[PDB]
Design a protein around this nucleic acid. Structure first.
Ligand SMILES: [Ag+]
Ligand SMILES: [Mg+2]
Ligand SMILES: [Zn+2]
Lengths: 54, 49, 100, 236, 97, 71, 128, 100, 244, 180, 127
RNA sequence: CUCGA
DNA sequence: CTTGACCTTCCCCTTGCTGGAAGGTTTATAATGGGAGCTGTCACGGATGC
């Protein structure tokens, strides 16, 4: 998702659909899309309580 | 009456008149555009034109 | 049903209909402010379902607003002025008002 | 198969003219081929007529049928297209004759119709605008960025409808035991649905009239100005 | 020009644009980068879901603010599960887990 | 080497030849001799007997033909 | 005064009075907080004026202008005599149409003995 | 020049042609003071005298069959006011030049 | 789904559709014609053309300008396909997901004022009356000055006496952002503590203009309010102008 | 949720998303503004038009929470569900997805080990392709011409099987083995 | 012989023949390997009987049994004469009441000369 | 499309 | 609390048709290959094809 919003959405979505690619929402441009707290700043303290209890 | 009314009213050169002066009315008619049909565009004009 | 330009307006008191004339269009030369009504135009509304507590309120009191609905023309906000010209066009086969 | 494949130029000779922009160019050819395949099975060779005499009708019918059933977003029936086209042919002739654009009142004189009928037919047309068209001369401002959603409930009209619900839940507490329940399920307040007079009379004992008397006494209790002062300003 | 609430758009359900249209200003990605750099993630979660694009988010925040309790109530934006329907219509199965 | 479909369609239809005046009569004779075998070969089946029964019993209670030819 | 005895005062029925209201020819009867209707002497005159038209005088479309002119204070005697005389003339033209039917059945019914012999001439002749 | 370049056009089989005679610009229906009011194009109706001729079939060069000459209306052209401002749909519009 | 490609009537009676109802209608039309042609026992030159046309109508829907000539509508314009709705500067990604249009926002011409401090900024009264409207309703209902919201909106519509003394309680200790486009670097958006001036121009402190690169010659700045109690603390300890 | 997955879509998955097959190209009616049966806007497939009303109006008023009308088939729910219900079209012939065909690299000739210039002579109905050859004079994926197929049909009979169109490429991808 | 050519021989409307086929009056016509009504001279005789019966004064049901009295070969004409005498008696009963309307309307149209007054002798009787 | 920073 | 008498609106029903809407089926001199639109950007990366 961090590549499909940048450039060449057709090639990035096609290459990642025949491979069965699994996203993980690591960076802080996918959390802006899905409407979630980014893993930096004040969200980073909260994000460890989600990462640890999982 | 479709083609003539299309030109007078939908072209890139049949533009609205600036009428908030006597000056701005008279310098909008002596304006030589270079865009439109058979010309350049604002994404394909370098430093040379 | 067709819409109508009437001086009668629902849910609006006398304080906004002071400048509207007999026919519903504002006088020439009347000083207006932001929000005041220039042309009183009402539109018919198809009947809708009602939430039950409002259905209780309209049985406690006798208020029954009709299918009329206000969608009139108001001056946009932060604007003073003075009505200096009013033009009225009408279709063929339609009876004109008193102002027209 | 050979008679169908041999006359495949006649259909593209007829379908040059019906390219008025409802359908693409290939769809007219593919409808005219089905017209030609209908024309092959009907064609009698006994009458001494050539095949192009007969098959032109069955090609023109198929093209002019598909162009009136398809090629429109809001689909117009077939008999209304004739009523539109008579009006448009008469309005084409009146411009050459008079020189001025015909009003519907003088158009109804030529059409021999009532004027409201002609005003009804001149409403059906004008196939819809694309929501991606640009409304200035731009390319960044499409028409689809100006259409306001009207089905949404207002956030101020969705905050007062909770305060009214809370105030109705408040003021019904002073009503003691029977008039509260029959007032709630008489107007459907906090119920799945509304109950009629006999369906709520069958719940308490049997009675139809006693329920109405309880309702009238409850409304007389509510209208007394010691509880409904809060519900005065919910009215307007 | 100033605007609190009103006249949301049709498909995307985020508010309109224009002073004559009574629309709010655009919080473009040039400002989303500038709020990522400050680390203010709670101002970024608010200016994506509960201010603009949610449907069950605005009319709850309005009751919370009028009631006197400033409390964020998040939710997925409506512009994301239109992107899911427009990717899914290409025969490309995209889901959540 | 092309992508316009109308060129492909016209190139595909271009291989066949137009017909003369007697060619259509020849192909019509072919169609009539194709259906006449089905007509003269169905006469050895009981469904043809059923067709005869229904078609004369319909006119039992009854160019545009004269009714005496149908009787 | 509701719609209880006004139907018996004038002579009509209840559904007739409601239909006369719905057709748009009398004063709309005033309502009092129950959906019920009220009546005054104006309606007690107008309903009799329209009922007496229906039995002897007029029809429902012509009985509208009569009560439209009766309630007016500026009514004149010019706009009544023409409207009764032209339809008395129409009544006599209907008398003549019924006389046409009368003698077209009288001249046809004669000279045809109806007995046990079939092939009667008049019925086979009026067929064609 | 635009008429004389296209016309005279002939029939497909070479048995007729449309000849062009002259054109004529009629009077404008409205003046410029009310085209800015009612919202209509300040234009002039364009008429043209056209001559349709029928050439005989068997004749080698036979023009004498019939001469049909009639005046045909074809569209309008928007006139120019005394300053170079076309009035299209009530709003004054100016066409700039081009440099190609 | 039929509410992401809608068909809405406008004011004048003309409808206004999206363009997916043309490409979809072409696919359904040519598919029905292929179903009819396979039951008529048509020759091969017709069926081979009809399958080709069905394939052309499918990939004119999935991605328009890729196979051959782009499909044009009636405006002599290429129709926007499904792949033209997620790419470029007009897709869902770059225009409607990464950056949205927000509520509680404003826009005005900036002006200089040197009487301020480093953490303050001016604000017009007619702008802060519109940005802080639900806060004003929540303060007017708490003090009993209006019994409901529908009777509290009329006290703001009349601009009474008690509103301008409630606004000074609502506004104080409530920061407000100030964005100027183009927001180049991190200091291009800062949070100030507002005051209330009459007029129609945001009065800015003269020292922060080096960070904004703002010359007072008709510039405009956007006003964004933080709503919650966490965001209001991320504008005092993280984005206040006395910290940058 | 904590992760987004993306993959290809089987026809069983598209039938599992779908709520009803669209059959007619009609959008709405011209006199009243109502959606038509089995159209692109149909009330049976994609949900009702107004809140808690069917088309005919036989059921209203929130009492019927989830019933389906017997006349018009409309399930009485909110009109919010018109943004979440999808339908499907049953194609009368298979067709190729353009993303997995004409992206660069080809992604469908990358698997078949065949150039795109050779695949597009089979998607367009221009040249046959050999799916399998029982007699190994005709190899796998050896493209025959239009007239050469007439020689190969008479020299072998029905020992080979050649097709043309998108079903040829579908039977070519279907009859491969990845584990060899 | 379709439905439009029998509209020109007799004079009925093309919708009225379908109406008379809907109700029980005429003989049902055959179909023509398709949805098309075909007509013989029997239906022509029944329709030119029914149009004349409508024009002389019979209603739809006594004509509806008159047509059945015409179809059967018996037609014992005693009930035929009975029904025609009942019909002319019905015409007498209508014309006596209609001329009674005439007599009761002529006695009140004597007064009211038609001046510019505000009183009328006719508007006061029925009111 | 023209204008403003 | 109870009984019968009255009210409300709304749906169906009475003749002798007539008006309108929505759908389907034919028609026989001879007609046999489209046309609209593009040219005044530059710089790559990387398929592709002898
Ligand atoms: Ag007799
Ligand atoms: Mg500046
Ligand atoms: Zn239903």
């Amino acid at each position: 998702i961090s590549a499909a919003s940048f450039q060449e959405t057709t090639r990035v979505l096609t290459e990642a659909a025949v491979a069965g690619k699994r996203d993980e929402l690591r960076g802080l441009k996918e959390n802006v899309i899905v409407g979630r707290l980014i893993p930096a700043g004040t969200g980073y303290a909260y994000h460890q309580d989600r990462m640890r209890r999982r | 009456s479709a083609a003539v009314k299309e030109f007078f009213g939908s072209s890139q050169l049949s533009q609205f008149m600036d009428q908030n002066n006597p000056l701005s009315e008279i310098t909008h008619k002596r304006r030589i555009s270079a865009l439109g049909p058979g010309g350049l565009t604002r994404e394909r004009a370098g430093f040379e034109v | 049903g067709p819409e109508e330009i009437t001086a009668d307006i629902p849910n609006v008191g006398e304080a906004a209909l002071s400048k509207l004339d007999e026919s519903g269009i504002v006088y020439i030369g009347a000083e207006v402010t932001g929000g005041d009504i220039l042309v009183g135009k009402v539109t018919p509304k198809g009947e809708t379902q009602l939430t039950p507590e409002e259905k209780l309120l309209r049985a406690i009191f006798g208020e029954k607003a009709s299918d009329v609905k206000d969608s009139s023309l108001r001056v946009p906000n932060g604007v003073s002025g003075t009505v200096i010209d009013v033009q009225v066009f009408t279709r063929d086969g339609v009876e004109k008002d008193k102002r027209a | 198969k050979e008679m169908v494949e041999a006359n495949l130029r006649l259909v593209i000779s007829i379908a040059k003219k019906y390219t008025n922009r409802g359908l693409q160019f290939l769809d007219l050819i593919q409808e005219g081929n089905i017209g030609l395949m209908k024309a092959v099975d009907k064609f009698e060779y006994r009458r001494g007529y050539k095949f192009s005499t007969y098959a032109t009708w069955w090609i023109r019918q198929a093209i002019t049928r598909s162009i009136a059933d398809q090629a429109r977003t809001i689909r117009i029936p077939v008999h209304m297209i004739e009523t539109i086209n008579k009006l448009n042919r008469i309005s084409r002739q009146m411009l050459q004759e008079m020189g001025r654009e015909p009003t519907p009142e003088e158009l109804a004189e030529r059409m021999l119709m009532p004027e409201d009928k002609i005003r009804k037919v001149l409403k059906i047309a004008k196939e819809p605008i694309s929501m991606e068209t640009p409304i200035g001369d731009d390319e960044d401002s499409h028409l689809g960025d100006f259409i306001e959603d009207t089905t949404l409930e207002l956030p101020l009209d969705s905050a007062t409808t909770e305060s009214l619900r809370a105030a109705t839940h408040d003021v019904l507490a002073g009503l003691t035991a029977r008039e509260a329940k029959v007032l709630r399920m008489r107007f459907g307040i906090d119920m799945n649905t509304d109950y009629t007079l006999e369906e709520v009379g069958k719940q308490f004992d049997v009675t139809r009239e006693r329920i109405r008397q309880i309702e009238a006494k409850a409304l007389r209790k509510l209208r007394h100005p010691s509880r409904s002062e809060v519900l005065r300003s919910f009215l307007d | 020009h100033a605007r609190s609430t009103g006249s949301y758009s049709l498909v995307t359900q985020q508010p309109l644009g224009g002073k004559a249209q009574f629309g709010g200003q655009r919080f473009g990605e040039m400002e989303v980068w500038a709020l990522e750099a400050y680390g203010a993630a709670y101002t970024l979660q608010e200016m994506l879901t509960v201010k603009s694009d949610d449907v069950n988010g605005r009319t709850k925040m309005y009751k919370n603010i009028v009631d006197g309790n400033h409390q964020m109530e998040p939710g997925m934006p409506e512009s994301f599960n239109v992107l899911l329907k427009e990717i899914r219509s290409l025969g490309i199965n995209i889901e959540l887990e | 080497r092309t992508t316009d479909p109308v060129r492909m369609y016209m190139r595909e239809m271009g291989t066949v030849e137009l017909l003369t005046r007697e060619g259509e009569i020849d192909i019509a004779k072919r169609i009539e001799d194709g259906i006449n075998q089905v007509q003269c070969s169905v006469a050895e089946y009981p469904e043809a007997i059923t067709y005869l029964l229904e078609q004369y019993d319909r006119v039992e209670a009854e160019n545009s033909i004269d009714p005496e030819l149908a009787r | 005064m509701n719609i209880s005895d006004v139907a018996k005062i004038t002579g009509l029925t209840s559904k007739a009075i409601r239909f006369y209201e719905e057709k748009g020819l009398v004063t709309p009867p005033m309502r009092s907080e129950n959906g019920y209707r009220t009546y005054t002497q104006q309606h007690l005159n107008e309903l009799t004026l329209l009922r007496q038209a229906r039995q002897v005088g007029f029809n429902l479309e012509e009985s509208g202008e009569l009560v439209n002119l009766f309630n007016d204070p500026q009514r004149h005697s010019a706009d009544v005599k023409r409207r009764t005389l032209e339809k008395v003339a129409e009544i006599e033209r209907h008398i003549e149409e019924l006389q046409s039917m009368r003698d077209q059945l009288l001249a046809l019914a004669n000279a045809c003995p109806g007995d046990d012999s079939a092939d009667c001439p008049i019925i086979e002749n009026l067929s064609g | 020049a635009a008429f004389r370049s296209v016309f005279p056009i002939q029939s497909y089989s070479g048995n007729s042609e449309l000849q062009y005679v002259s054109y004529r610009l009629g009077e404008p229906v409205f003046d410029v003071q009310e085209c800015q009011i009612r919202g209509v194009t300040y234009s002039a109706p364009l008429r043209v005298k056209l001559r349709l001729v029928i050439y005989e079939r068997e004749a080698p060069e036979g023009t004498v069959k019939d001469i049909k000459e009639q005046e045909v209306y074809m569209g309008e052209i928007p006139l120019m006011t005394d300053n170079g401002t076309f009035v299209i749909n009530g709003t004054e519009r100016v066409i700039v030049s081009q440099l190609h | 789904p039929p509410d992401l490609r809608p068909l809405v009537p406008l004011d004048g009676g003309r409808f206004a559709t999206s363009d997916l109802n043309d490409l979809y209608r072409r696919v359904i039309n040519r598919n029905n014609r292929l179903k009819r042609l396979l039951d008529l026992a048509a020759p091969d030159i017709i069926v081979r053309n009809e399958k080709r046309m069905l394939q052309e109508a499918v990939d004119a829907l999935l991605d328009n300008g890729r196979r051959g000539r782009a499909i044009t509508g009636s405006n002599k314009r290429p129709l926007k396909s499904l792949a033209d709705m997620i790419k470029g500067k007009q897709g869902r990604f770059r225009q409607n997901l990464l950056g949205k249009r927000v509520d509680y926002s404003g826009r005005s011409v900036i002006t200089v004022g040197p009487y301020l401090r480093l953490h303050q900024c001016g604000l017009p009264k007619k702008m802060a009356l519109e940005l802080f409207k639900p806060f004003i309703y929540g303060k007017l209902e708490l003090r009993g000055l209006a019994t409901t919201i529908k009777a509290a909106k009329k006290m703001v519509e009349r601009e009474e006496a008690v509103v301008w003394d409630i606004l000074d309680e609502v506004i104080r200790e409530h920061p407000v952002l100030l964005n100027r486009a183009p927001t180049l670097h991190r200091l291009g958006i800062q949070a100030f503590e507002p005051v209330l001036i009459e007029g129609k121009a945001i009065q800015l402190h003269p020292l922060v203009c080096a960070a904004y690169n703002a010359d007072f010659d008709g510039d405009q700045m956007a006003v964004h309010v933080p709503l919650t109690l966490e965001a209001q603390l991320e504008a005092r300890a993280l984005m206040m102008s006395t910290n940058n | 949720f904590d992760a987004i997955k993306i993959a290809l879509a089987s026809p069983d998955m598209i039938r599992s998303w779908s709520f009803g097959e669209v059959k007619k190209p009609e959008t709405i009616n011209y006199r009243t503004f109502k959606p038509e049966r089995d159209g692109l806007f149909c009330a049976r497939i994609f949900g009702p038009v107004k809140d808690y009303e069917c088309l005919c109006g036989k059921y209203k008023r929130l009492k019927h929470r989830g019933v389906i009308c017997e006349k018009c088939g409309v399930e009485v729910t909110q009109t919010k569900v018109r943004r979440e219900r999808m339908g499907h079209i049953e194609l009368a012939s298979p067709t190729a997805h353009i993303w997995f065909l004409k992206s660069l690299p080809s992604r469908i000739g990358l698997l078949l080990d065949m150039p795109l210039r050779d695949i597009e002579r089979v998607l367009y109905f221009e040249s046959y392709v050999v799916i399998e050859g029982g007699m190994t004079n005709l190899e796998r994926q050896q493209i025959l011409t239009e007239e050469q197929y007439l020689d190969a049909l008479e020299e072998f009979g029905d020992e080979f099987d050649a097709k043309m169109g998108a079903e040829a490429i579908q039977a070519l991808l279907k009859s491969m083995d990845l584990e060899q």
